Structure formats: C-alpha cells, structure tokens
Design a binder for these strands. Sequence first.
RNA 1: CCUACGGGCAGGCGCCGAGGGUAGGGCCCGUGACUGGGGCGAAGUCGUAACAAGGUAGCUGUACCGGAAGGUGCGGCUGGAUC
RNA 2: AUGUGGACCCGCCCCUUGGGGUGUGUCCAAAGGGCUUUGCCCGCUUCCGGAUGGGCCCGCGUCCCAUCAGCUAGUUGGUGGGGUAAUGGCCCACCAAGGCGACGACGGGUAGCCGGUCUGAGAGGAUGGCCGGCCACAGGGGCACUGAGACACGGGCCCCACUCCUACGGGAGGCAGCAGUUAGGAAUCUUCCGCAAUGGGCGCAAGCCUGACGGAGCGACGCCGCUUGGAGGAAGAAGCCCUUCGGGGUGUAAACUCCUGAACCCGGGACGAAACCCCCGACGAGGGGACUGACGGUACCGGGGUAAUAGCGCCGGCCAACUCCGUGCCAGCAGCCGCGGUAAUACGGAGGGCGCGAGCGUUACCCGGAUUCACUGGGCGUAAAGGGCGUGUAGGCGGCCUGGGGCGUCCCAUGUGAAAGACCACGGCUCAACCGUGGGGGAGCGUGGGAUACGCUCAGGCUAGACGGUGGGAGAGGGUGGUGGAAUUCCCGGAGUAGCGGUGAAAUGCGCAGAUACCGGGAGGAACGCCGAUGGCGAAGGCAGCCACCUGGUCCACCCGUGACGCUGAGGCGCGAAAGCGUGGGGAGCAAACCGGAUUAGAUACCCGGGUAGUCCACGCCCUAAACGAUGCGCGCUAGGUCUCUGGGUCUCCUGGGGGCCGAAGCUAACGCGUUAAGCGCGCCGCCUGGGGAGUACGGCCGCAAGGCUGAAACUCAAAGGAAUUGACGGGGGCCCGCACAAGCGGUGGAGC
Lengths: 125, 138
Amino acid sequence: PTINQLVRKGREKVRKKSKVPALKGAPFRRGVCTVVRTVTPKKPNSALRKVAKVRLTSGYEVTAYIPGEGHNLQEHSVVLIRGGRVKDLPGVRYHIVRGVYDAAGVKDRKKSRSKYGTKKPKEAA
Amino acid sequence: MLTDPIADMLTRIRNATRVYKESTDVPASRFKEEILRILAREGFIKGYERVDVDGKPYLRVYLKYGPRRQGPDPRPEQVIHHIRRISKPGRRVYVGVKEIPRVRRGLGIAILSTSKGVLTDREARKLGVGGELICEVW
RNA sequence: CCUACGGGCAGGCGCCGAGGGUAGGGCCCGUGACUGGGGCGAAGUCGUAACAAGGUAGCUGUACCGGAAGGUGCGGCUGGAUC
RNA sequence: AUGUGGACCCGCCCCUUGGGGUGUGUCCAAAGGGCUUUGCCCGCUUCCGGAUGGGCCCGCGUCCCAUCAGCUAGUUGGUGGGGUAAUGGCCCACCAAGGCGACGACGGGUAGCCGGUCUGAGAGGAUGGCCGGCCACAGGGGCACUGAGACACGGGCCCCACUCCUACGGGAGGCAGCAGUUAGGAAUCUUCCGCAAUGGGCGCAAGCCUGACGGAGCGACGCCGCUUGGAGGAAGAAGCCCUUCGGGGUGUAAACUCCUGAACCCGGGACGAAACCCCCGACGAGGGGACUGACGGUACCGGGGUAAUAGCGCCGGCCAACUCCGUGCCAGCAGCCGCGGUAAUACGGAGGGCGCGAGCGUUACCCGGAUUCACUGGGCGUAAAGGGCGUGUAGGCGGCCUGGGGCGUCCCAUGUGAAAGACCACGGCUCAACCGUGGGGGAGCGUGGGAUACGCUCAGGCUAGACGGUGGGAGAGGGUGGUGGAAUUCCCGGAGUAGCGGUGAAAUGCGCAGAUACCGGGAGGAACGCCGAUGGCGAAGGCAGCCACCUGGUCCACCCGUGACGCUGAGGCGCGAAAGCGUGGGGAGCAAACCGGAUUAGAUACCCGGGUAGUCCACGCCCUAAACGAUGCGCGCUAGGUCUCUGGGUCUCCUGGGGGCCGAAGCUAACGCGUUAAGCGCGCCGCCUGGGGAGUACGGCCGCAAGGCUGAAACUCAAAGGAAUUGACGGGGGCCCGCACAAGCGGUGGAGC
Ligand SMILES: NC[C@@H]1O[C@H](O[C@H]2[C@@H](O)[C@H](O[C@@H]3[C@@H](O)[C@H](N)C[C@H](N)[C@H]3O[C@H]3O[C@H](CO)[C@@H](O)[C@H](O)[C@H]3N)O[C@@H]2CO)[C@H](N)[C@@H](O)[C@@H]1O
Ligand SMILES: NC[C@@H]1O[C@H](O[C@H]2[C@@H](O)[C@H](O[C@@H]3[C@@H](O)[C@H](N)C[C@H](N)[C@H]3O[C@H]3O[C@H](CO)[C@@H](O)[C@H](O)[C@H]3N)O[C@@H]2CO)[C@H](N)[C@@H](O)[C@@H]1O
Ligand SMILES: NC[C@@H]1O[C@H](O[C@H]2[C@@H](O)[C@H](O[C@@H]3[C@@H](O)[C@H](N)C[C@H](N)[C@H]3O[C@H]3O[C@H](CO)[C@@H](O)[C@H](O)[C@H]3N)O[C@@H]2CO)[C@H](N)[C@@H](O)[C@@H]1O
Ligand SMILES: NC[C@@H]1O[C@H](O[C@H]2[C@@H](O)[C@H](O[C@@H]3[C@@H](O)[C@H](N)C[C@H](N)[C@H]3O[C@H]3O[C@H](CO)[C@@H](O)[C@H](O)[C@H]3N)O[C@@H]2CO)[C@H](N)[C@@H](O)[C@@H]1O
Ligand SMILES: [Mg+2]
Ligand SMILES: [Mg+2]
Ligand SMILES: [Mg+2]
Ligand SMILES: [Mg+2]
Ligand SMILES: [Mg+2]
Ligand SMILES: [Mg+2]
Ligand SMILES: [Mg+2]
Ligand SMILES: [Mg+2]
Ligand SMILES: [Mg+2]
Ligand SMILES: [Mg+2]
Ligand SMILES: [Mg+2]
Ligand SMILES: [Mg+2]
Ligand SMILES: [Mg+2]
Ligand SMILES: [Mg+2]
Ligand SMILES: [Mg+2]
Ligand SMILES: [Mg+2]
Ligand SMILES: [Mg+2]
Ligand SMILES: [Mg+2]
Ligand SMILES: [Mg+2]
Ligand SMILES: [Mg+2]
Ligand SMILES: [Mg+2]
Ligand SMILES: [Mg+2]
Ligand SMILES: [Mg+2]
Ligand SMILES: [Mg+2]
Ligand SMILES: [Mg+2]
Ligand SMILES: [Mg+2]
Ligand SMILES: [Mg+2]
Ligand SMILES: [Mg+2]
Ligand SMILES: [Mg+2]
Ligand SMILES: [Mg+2]
Ligand SMILES: [Mg+2]
Ligand SMILES: [Mg+2]
Ligand SMILES: [Mg+2]
Ligand SMILES: [Mg+2]
Ligand SMILES: [Mg+2]
Ligand SMILES: [Mg+2]
Ligand SMILES: [Mg+2]
Ligand SMILES: [Mg+2]
Ligand SMILES: [Mg+2]
Ligand SMILES: [Mg+2]
Ligand SMILES: [Mg+2]
Ligand SMILES: [Mg+2]
Ligand SMILES: [Mg+2]
Ligand SMILES: [Mg+2]
Ligand SMILES: [Mg+2]
Ligand SMILES: [Mg+2]
Ligand SMILES: [Mg+2]
Ligand SMILES: [Mg+2]
Ligand SMILES: [Mg+2]
Ligand SMILES: [Mg+2]
Ligand SMILES: [Mg+2]
Ligand SMILES: [Mg+2]
Ligand SMILES: [Mg+2]
Ligand SMILES: [Mg+2]
Ligand SMILES: [Mg+2]
Ligand SMILES: [Mg+2]
Ligand SMILES: [Mg+2]
Ligand SMILES: [Mg+2]
Ligand SMILES: [Mg+2]
Ligand SMILES: [Mg+2]
Ligand SMILES: [Mg+2]
Ligand SMILES: [Mg+2]
C-alpha cells in the first residue's frame, strides 16, 4: 500500500493461537481420570489406542493419551497431563506423563526411559 | 500532471539507455541541470545541453555505453547499470552526514541535495553536510 | 462549663457525605427445559450433480419447487467443445 | 515588653503574572539545660541566604476493539468568594453558552510505567522477573486529626465482610515487615546467626533501638570453575554382538606396570576494623592511646594422604549416528513428512555408533527462521486480493522562473541523557563466574549560532498541465411525445374438409359447435428483420424501426483567451442487468410454480401439451452479479508492422482520436502482456495475508418483505490453490487399419455320445 495508506492504517500484528489450554500455559496440569477407554485411529492407521478422559484442576475435562508399552490406569486415577497432541486420535491434544501420581512408569523399558518415567534397572548396573 | 520531475528525468534516462539510444530530451529545470552536472562529471553520461523542442526548454542528454560485446547478444555493457530515486513526494528522505550511505562500496554515487548545493556523497561528506537524498546511481 | 467580658468549650441545627432502600434503564457471566446447524471419524443407505460435449455445456444473481444431490424460470459470464 | 528583622493594608519607585525596594499606620519573637562554673558546651527566637527533598503546570511520547460514534451540565468560559504552601471549576454563589470528537472523543478490554531484559544482520518483535528510579496500595469503602511532611502498613474515627473473646450489655484483631503455618497449585527456602561492617532514629556522650543490613541455612533453579585419574599396556583376554564361517566389532578399552594424589586426617590461621571514645594540642588541624568479628576455626598457607561417580537423549529424511533378533496395520512410534499388513536402519530389545555431560531430555512461553503485516522488505489478469460505476468533502500529493521568511531539512557549539546494565582497556578474588577503577560510545529533548539545494510559506512572473473561445465532425449516450411495417394470438367474414399438431417413437391436446392449410376485414400486446461489422456510443450498468423536441459526453483544426485554476479521493451523495417487492394499469407471445402426456428401474428432470406470478407501462422500493478485461484512476517514458472506425493536411503519403491482430526492448510462475502493458517510473484510493467452519453466528445499519452491507470465534485439515508437462480417458475432432461389422458359406446353443 502507499505510504500515506500505511500511515493512515498501518500493518496488523498477527496473534498466535494456543494449541493447548493446560489452561494458563503452565507446563503441566493435574487431573483425575474418568473413563479409561481404547480408541481406534483414523486416516491410514489401525490400532487400539489407550486414552484417558481427564477432569483437570484447570476446570477443563479433556482427553489425553497414555503413552508407553502398557499401563495401570483405572477410573479414579489422578494423573499429570503435559500437552502433545496425538494426531491419529482426533481431540487428543495432551499426553499423560508417566511416573507421576497414579500412572506408574513403564516396566521392562530399557531405552528412552526418562519419557515413560522408569528408573534405572540394576543387573549389569 | 507529472508528480516527480526528477523521477521522470531519471526514468527517461533509465528507458533510453535500455534501448541504446544516443540521446534523450527531458523538460528543463535548473534543479534537473545540477543533477546532470554531477551525472556528467562522474562519467555516467557523455554530457548534456539546453535545447528548444517546439520552442520549449529541454535538456538533451547524451548517453554513454560500453563497447560491443562478444557472443550472442553483443549489446554493450551499460554505464548506468542502476539509477533510482530515494526521496520522493510521497516520502521525503533526509540524512545527516553520518548516515549518508556508501553506494555499492563507492563504485556508485548518491546524488544529494544540500544547503551547499547538489552534491555526491563524497563531495558532501568532505564538505561535512547532508540533506535530501535524491537518488542513487551505479 | 471556663472567662481578663473580648472570647473559648460543651452542646444543637444544617450542607456535603461511605454506604442502605425503592422504582425504572443498561451491561457482564452462570445455568438451562426445549431447539438449529457444524466439524471430525477405513469398508452403512438412496440416487449420480460435477470433472471428457460428464452424456440436459458449466458457472452465476435472483425467484419458485423438490427425499437428496438438484430442476426449472429470467438475465449475465466463458472461466464452454464441435465448424 | 524589646523589633535586628518579618507580616498585612495604602502609596511611591524599579521590575514586569504574586520579583526587588521604600514611607506612614497596624501586627508578630524567644527556653532553658549542662558543666573539670565569669566562659565554654547542648539548646531557644526572628530574619536573609545556601543545600537537600518535594507540590503544582506545560510540549512531546506511552497497548487492543470502531461488531464502542457521537460525548459533556461543574459540563466549557467568565465575575466575586471560599480552600491551599501555591496555581486552578479544587469547591461555592451568580452570569455567559460553552467544551471535546474519525489526527478517534465516549465506551469496553487488558495492564503498574521506566532504566532495562530477551531476540534479531538491522529495522523490528516480545518483555518489565532480579537490581535502581517514580507511582499506587496496606482485609474492602470513606474521612479527617496531629504535624515541616501523612489523609499515615505495625496512628485515630465511621460503615462493610470475615476470624476470636464475651457475665449477651459489649469488645479484640489486620504478616503485600522477618521467619513460619495452612489453602490453592505443575512449582518456589530457615519459625537460623549477628549488629562486627554499611546505613538509619533518638542522644553532649556512653549508648539504646534497627528481621534495614551483613552473613549463614535450604533447592544442579541459573552462571562460572573443578573431580570421577595420568603414562605405558596384544595383531588384540574373556563375556556380549555381527559374519560371506575365512573374519570383523566393543578395544588401549579392560586385566596388569609404574606415576600423580579429589575425598579424608594433622598443624598454623586471616583481610574485612578504624573510627566513635580517651590523652597532648584548642573540644579546630595534627599527633598519641584503648576497645571492637556474626561469617569462622571459614577463606588461605604448610605436613600427611586413598584410583577414587556417570549419566541422559538420539541413530528413516530434515540430522551427526546401522546392524541382529523380537514383532506382524498388533503392540506401539509420531515435531512435520510418515513408520508398523513376516526380512521394519522409523515399533521393543540387544550389540555397535552419534551428541552433550552433573547433567541430559520433556512440556510450556517469547523472539528467530517468517521478505508469512514486507519502513528496511510483499503483493492483487488466471494463485488470497481492484471497491459495480460515478460525483465529489476532509485528507494526501503538485509544472517552470525570481525574490523575501527559515517551519521542515542540514551544520557548529552547549545543557541533558543518574546509578546499574551494554562496549573497550587496566586491575581484585589461583581462573572464571562475580567484582573495582578508567575510558568510550548513546537515540531523544532544551538553549545559542550558522546554511538555504530540496520540502513548506509569503510576494511577484510565466505557459508546456488544466480550463475556456472560434470553426468543423462521427455516434444503438440519455429523456418525452409521435409514428411505421413484418410476425404471433384472438374476433368477424368467405372458401374448404378430416385431420392438424407434436416426437427418437409417441401420447396428452386441439378438430364435424367444422380445426389445420388459403384469402379478406378488425382488435390488441410485445419486439424491431435486412442494414449489422472483426462496427459505434456510454463512467459503469448498459444502449438498435423511423420522426420531431429536450439533453449529457467526446474528437479534429486555428493556437485567440485565463494563468497551475491541477491529480487522486476515506466518508457523503447519486447511478446501478436480471430476478424480486408495493400501488395502479396492461397482458399478444413466452413462461418459474402448478395441471397433464411421454421417457425411466424411479423421473419430483431433460422431451411434448396446457399454464399463473412474471416478462410490458407508470410511480415508488430493492442494490445484487462470472456488475469481467476476472486488470483502480491520472501523468510521463520505451521499436515497429498490419487491419479497422472517425477528424484535419500540401489528401502517393503525412498528422490527431478510438477499436483489433502480430510483435522491439522489457516483464511474467507460466499461460501471456507488450505505446489500448501485465514494460519503465511518480501520485492518491480500494483490497489480500493457508483450506474448511462461513459470507455462517453475534451485534449494528439499511429494507414493506425477499433480503442487503459490515463480519467473527470455537473446532478441524496438511493442504487448499495457479500455470504448465508427460500420459490415460471421452457418449470430443480428423486420418487409417484388422474376418471388427457388413456380404457370403459352414457351425455352436437343441439330441445322443
Ligand atoms: N464431510 C463433512 C461434510 O458432511 C458430509 O460428510 C460426512 C458424511 O456425509 C459422509 O458419510 C459417508 C457416506 O456419504 C458414504 N457413502 C458412506 C461412508 N461410510 C460415510 O462415511 C462417514 O461415516 C462413516 C461411518 O459410517 C465414517 O467411518 C467416516 O469417517 C465418514 N466418512 O462422511 C462424512 C463424515 O464427515 C458430506 N459428505 C459433505 O457435505 C461435507 O464434506
Ligand atoms: N499488482 C498489480 C497492480 O499494482 C498496481 O500498482 C503497482 C504497480 O503499478 C507498480 O508496481 C511495480 C510493478 O508494476 C512492477 N512489476 C515492478 C515493481 N517491482 C513494482 O513496484 C513496487 O514494488 C517494488 C518492490 O517489489 C517497490 O520497491 C516499488 O516502490 C513498488 N512500486 O506500482 C504499484 C505499486 O504497488 C495497482 N495497485 C493495481 O493495478 C494492481 O494492484
Ligand atoms: N565494570 C568493571 C567490571 O566490568 C565488567 O564488565 C565487563 C565484563 O562483565 C565483561 O567482560 C568480559 C571481557 O572483558 C572478557 N575479556 C571476556 C568475557 N567473556 C567478558 O565477560 C562477559 O561476557 C561473557 C559472554 O558475553 C559472559 O561471561 C558475561 O556476559 C560477562 N562475564 O563485559 C564487560 C566489558 O569487558 C562487569 N560486567 C562488571 O560487573 C564489573 O564492574
Ligand atoms: N415507442 C414509443 C416511445 O417509447 C417510450 O415509452 C412509451 C412507450 O414505448 C410505451 O408503450 C406504448 C404505450 O405508450 C401505449 N400505451 C401502449 C402501446 N402498446 C405501447 O406501444 C409502444 O411500446 C410497445 C412495446 O413493445 C409496442 O406497442 C411498440 O413497441 C410501441 N409502439 O409506453 C411509454 C409511454 O406510454 C418513450 N416513453 C417514448 O419515446 C415513446 O412513447
Ligand atoms: Mg499405517
Ligand atoms: Mg526515453
Ligand atoms: Mg544533533
Ligand atoms: Mg460543634
Ligand atoms: Mg472419533
Ligand atoms: Mg447439470
Ligand atoms: Mg454429446
Ligand atoms: Mg453426471
Ligand atoms: Mg451436464
Ligand atoms: Mg438459476
Ligand atoms: Mg420443476
Ligand atoms: Mg439462463
Ligand atoms: Mg528596622
Ligand atoms: Mg509582643
Ligand atoms: Mg481565586
Ligand atoms: Mg493489574
Ligand atoms: Mg526479520
Ligand atoms: Mg512496554
Ligand atoms: Mg484501606
Ligand atoms: Mg496514602
Ligand atoms: Mg503488619
Ligand atoms: Mg496441594
Ligand atoms: Mg550497626
Ligand atoms: Mg551505626
Ligand atoms: Mg590409560
Ligand atoms: Mg604415593
Ligand atoms: Mg545422517
Ligand atoms: Mg523413540
Ligand atoms: Mg524383521
Ligand atoms: Mg526415529
Ligand atoms: Mg529401535
Ligand atoms: Mg517479520
Ligand atoms: Mg513495502
Ligand atoms: Mg505474497
Ligand atoms: Mg482470484
Ligand atoms: Mg472495475
Ligand atoms: Mg474525482
Ligand atoms: Mg482536494
Ligand atoms: Mg513545487
Ligand atoms: Mg529552521
Ligand atoms: Mg547509565
Ligand atoms: Mg586478573
Ligand atoms: Mg539538539
Ligand atoms: Mg504564483
Ligand atoms: Mg387474417
Ligand atoms: Mg457488457
Ligand atoms: Mg495563446
Ligand atoms: Mg500575461
Ligand atoms: Mg435494479
Ligand atoms: Mg426487472
Ligand atoms: Mg410488480
Ligand atoms: Mg412432466
Ligand atoms: Mg412446457
Ligand atoms: Mg406454451
Ligand atoms: Mg483488451
Ligand atoms: Mg491506435
Ligand atoms: Mg502481443
Ligand atoms: Mg480460516
Ligand atoms: Mg491446471
Ligand atoms: Mg494432458
Ligand atoms: Mg457376418
Ligand atoms: Mg449339444
């Protein structure tokens, strides 16, 4: 646009939209499981994906993914949520953090252990 | 009505040179003449002169090019590779002497209007002045 | 009440006054019987509108009609193929 | 009472907002205490000056929403008061009718501001946590008192809410001081030591107070520094992993050999502290003297001395690092692309490898990349994007010559830009982190001086822009009235007879109340064939028989006039195809809806037969569009060729205005554009900022209604797009083949086998 036009109107700064009301941006939010269901993916994937509907302190009831080999979560479970969509599961915008509150960490996990939250094993160590 | 005669002049030059014209007339103005003087002194043009076209004051302006070139397209290199208004009616640009720019590491000019007359960057920097940043030519 | 008789103090009235009440206006959230569509989700149902002249060229403003895509009127466009 | 002085009224000088001075008149001071006691020490009074700190005012700057457009009645100004330290509608009486607003008032949202911080090549973007500066607050709301200073966190009053006491009458309380507890939360410390230092209050001093402060405690929370060893050490142990069974890997890595010696033990042991005070001198300068350490038995120095912690992420591509097993669209991974369906470098484990290392990853948030809001630095013919077109307000922009002013602009000098932080030196802790000193920058704003090219401004001039005059032109530009012929329908008459109509084929339908076809007459409605164009006119929409009247634009020639009078144009105002609406006419033909006939699996369609609104006129609405050149307006500049409409000339040819085609330079993603630019430039406007949700919801405005203008969000996708390429396909085209069909002769399908 002309200069006179920029002077009259100016440019508009672009507001960035949050992908995540773990409400106030706050890196983690604690909640209570409600339904611990299994959901099928979409698009070109097939599996039985493990999921918690979570009541939060933040007020929101949201659905979260339970990552890892297998889990120990039932209907009143109390867990920490972290954010991280799942992408094959629509409306699943958060993961549960394993190793915190009533989500025990993944047993038998040798490799990327600190996600999944499983302490150092002790046979050759 | 012609909003910027200097931009006009410059553009007449830009255009005539791109088809290797020997000359262009441009309606005459004292200010225009002063810019040409610089232009001529710095060896961008051959030179210029007052003339009447339908009995009205012009400035014929003798353009100047490289030699013929070799392969396909033997059109001459251009002396005025680039010529370009800066300050304009829509938006005047004024500089202090500390912020007069170095045009193409000095292989290029900037013409520049000051209270000690129209000057190139070097002339004006040594003369310790600034003013309206008219155009840059390389 | 005190007084050096000048006045002072108590006390009383009044204006303003946080806040309260009543009637009328506005605005912001909640919650909601009942209701309208929307997104998204490998393999459900009806047709086949569109893409090749898509088998009625298409698209379009508008107006009516119709399970549905749609069809028809009028006017426009070519962003229609065939000579 | 004294009055050095000061205050007030009046006057007079100087000065200029209430600043100095001066003359009558009036009015105003004081406090004592201590002595190593006649002369000192602490105080007291009035006045002037300084220093510090503040109050008030002003220019400029300081976020989002215009889906907040009008706001104001102490409002705006005035006269006179009150109140203050002081100006002021700060408050009050009276008077006037004012003040503010698209340069965004009013309203709503959100937020303490700044020095700085983070980011970024910069411009910019984000931010205001530590430290310093200012503001504001002290459970919520008001208020004043005291005082130099408060409307006062640990003062007072009242009202409200909550907690505690209560003999039910009444009271008490205020950690956003230091700790600390509890609640909330993903999450944030000790109810520590000390006044030794620095600073602060009172005190003549000694001292007293000081959760300011100096320290220590706790958290890898961050930054920096350091350790988990060093040198030898095999053609190379074992174990584990590959393997083409030969070999390869982990790997000098280990074991082992020398060497050093974090931790830990022994010893010494701080700097921070010289003043206050006392003595000499004089209670001054100077000199002498004594006390004082929380940190801390710490830092640091010296002697001895043990081989003494390693983890986390990653290895499909972006990206540094590959193999075996397990698994079989499962379990799972996943930042995006995407992995997984029996040979998965992508899942899980192993070996091996890469990267960082007392850390490594994760999530969240800011800037970056993102030239993806583009000032630097983008775009709008077909990708998102030119407003449907005009008229024109505010605004933006403005041809050539001369002179004046010097507002912008440029220059010099000067004040300011605190400290910290930032940059560079040199220093202090063994280094660094941290810190001391010094230097250097630094936008912006103030004052004084100067320049005058360009911009602005004032005055003067010009004629190239613009407008005008004279004469000549082409045109479906518009409005009103009139008028012409062809055709369709209907009505009347004649003649005429069995069908007409309609389709792929039909039927519905019309026809013996005589249709169709044919001639003659009449009525009406609507539209104008040839001319007609690849044509013309209009700003767009859009305009077509002929005539007249009224009227808008525009082109050429003369170069006669005015003298920059110009361009663009938010908003406003007007125009604005069709359909639609209102009132009233009109209605031939056509024809949504609708009534029928076909077709079809069905056919709410395509085909046929009917047919109302409507299509027509007037007046008033509506205001949309593929309102398209999908191309904003104006101006200048940059080869030509060719065809066409319309002027002028010396009429072979030249020169204007307009419509096309091909094409220089050039531009374009390409297609294409190309003196009728999409080329090169200037001015001004409108618009875009991934797709879907959605031109939806909400709000406002408009409308009789239909609806129109303005126009989101949640959620959700990794595309949605444009142009061009190769194919493939077509119930597209052209050319052509084959026992492909046609032309033939014999078969199969029937029967038995
Ligand atoms: N897609 C959203 C919108 O609504 C519709 O889309 C939705 C449905 O119409 C459509 O339904 C289709 C159906 O038409 C088609 N013939 C059969 C198909 N199974 C259905 O599929 C749908 O439903 C199945 C479950 O039955 C889901 O597994 C699947 O996600 C979804 N595609 O799938 C869409 C799921 O959102 C319209 N197609 C379209 O107008 C528009 O895009
Ligand atoms: N986008 C096409 C059109 O742009 C038109 O206006 C623009 C064009 O005329 C012209 O823009 C030119 C462009 O033509 C031509 N292709 C070259 C040049 N790069 C552009 O220029 C523009 O952009 C450059 C930066 O790229 C700037 O530096 C420059 O100042 C600016 N004029 O100048 C205007 C600047 O935007 C009209 N708005 C409209 O017709 C349409 O939007
Ligand atoms: N003013 C004197 C001292 O100056 C210092 O300022 C200096 C230092 O802090 C710093 O200087 C040093 C530099 O001199 C020396 N040659 C190298 C060192 N990297 C720099 O240090 C700085 O830079 C690095 C990274 O930027 C960081 O560690 C940190 O920003 C800072 N220490 O930058 C400033 C100029 O050198 C301190 N900041 C300050 O606290 C102290 O007073
Ligand atoms: N043709 C006439 C012109 O048309 C315009 O408008 C007029 C007429 O066109 C219009 O229609 C007239 C009507 O006047 C009269 N009352 C009825 C008559 N049938 C109509 O006649 C006219 O229009 C229709 C339209 O097809 C046709 O008959 C035919 O074209 C013409 N003769 O009505 C308007 C006045 O009644 C202009 N107003 C004017 O120049 C002039 O009347
Ligand atoms: Mg898959
Ligand atoms: Mg030229
Ligand atoms: Mg300066
Ligand atoms: Mg009283
Ligand atoms: Mg689902
Ligand atoms: Mg169709
Ligand atoms: Mg066809
Ligand atoms: Mg179809
Ligand atoms: Mg079709
Ligand atoms: Mg339609
Ligand atoms: Mg229909
Ligand atoms: Mg049509
Ligand atoms: Mg005296
Ligand atoms: Mg007295
Ligand atoms: Mg007063
Ligand atoms: Mg706040
Ligand atoms: Mg950048
Ligand atoms: Mg800020
Ligand atoms: Mg309070
Ligand atoms: Mg206060
Ligand atoms: Mg307190
Ligand atoms: Mg808790
Ligand atoms: Mg102390
Ligand atoms: Mg002290
Ligand atoms: Mg070694
Ligand atoms: Mg030893
Ligand atoms: Mg690699
Ligand atoms: Mg992984
Ligand atoms: Mg495998
Ligand atoms: Mg991977
Ligand atoms: Mg793996
Ligand atoms: Mg940017
Ligand atoms: Mg730009
Ligand atoms: Mg772009
Ligand atoms: Mg577009
Ligand atoms: Mg247009
Ligand atoms: Mg205009
Ligand atoms: Mg104007
Ligand atoms: Mg000018
Ligand atoms: Mg000046
Ligand atoms: Mg500073
Ligand atoms: Mg050093
Ligand atoms: Mg200055
Ligand atoms: Mg003049
Ligand atoms: Mg007849
Ligand atoms: Mg048209
Ligand atoms: Mg003349
Ligand atoms: Mg004259
Ligand atoms: Mg209309
Ligand atoms: Mg109409
Ligand atoms: Mg009507
Ligand atoms: Mg039918
Ligand atoms: Mg019909
Ligand atoms: Mg009909
Ligand atoms: Mg064109
Ligand atoms: Mg032409
Ligand atoms: Mg072309
Ligand atoms: Mg969107
Ligand atoms: Mg394409
Ligand atoms: Mg193709
Ligand atoms: Mg045959
Ligand atoms: Mg047989």
